[PDB]
Amino acid sequence: GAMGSMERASLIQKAKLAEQAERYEDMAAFMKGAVEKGEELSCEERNLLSVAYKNVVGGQRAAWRVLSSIEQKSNEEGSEEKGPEVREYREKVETELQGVCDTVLGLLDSHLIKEAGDAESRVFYLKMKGDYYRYLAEVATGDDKKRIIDSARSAYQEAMDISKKEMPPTNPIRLGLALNFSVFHYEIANSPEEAISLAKTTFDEAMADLHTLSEDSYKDSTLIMQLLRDNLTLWT
């Protein structure tokens, strides 16, 4: 790896610089290098990893959706044939997106998940595993769309089981996991009732636990709760 010669601390420092500069591809490469040093990630480092790859794949997903929409219109009645280019370029972006997802899933499998014993880290990494299988599922069509969907579900489910046993209902990682698993149900698994039920139950149990928190803990938490409510309002 091209980051093999750089100190772990320097990789973390540069990931933070890359974040400040909104250079998320660089950020992701620095954080991959840090993971490959073989040591566990701290809480802050896990956030750097997630932010970097979420932003890289987020841009790829946005571009893929633009191109897929153009492609679908090109295949409607009365559309002029313009050749293979739209498909080719959509495929190019898709393959790049799949590559980034595969890279993240490989880091999680080698060896972040197996060394993660504390609930915070284990739920965090399993949520990411669900997220990146979900992104693979968004572009999947062939003989493994179903296996990819079940891989996402399995990871989200294991994270959910741990989060409910080991984390308070207002924990931001537990909340964000529930938010994203609810979106998986709505958008991937064709299970809108499960999506709504999960978002509602999560919101209500978090509300009832807010009284235990300091003013700052009452923050990204109430923040993610608003996202649950936003989704519920979109869906009902």
């Binding site: 997220d131 938010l179 979106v183 709505y186 996202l227």
Partner: peptide, 5 residues
């Protein structure tokens, strides 16, 4: 699209 974090 719905919100994810």
């Amino acid at each position: 699209f719905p919100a994810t974090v």
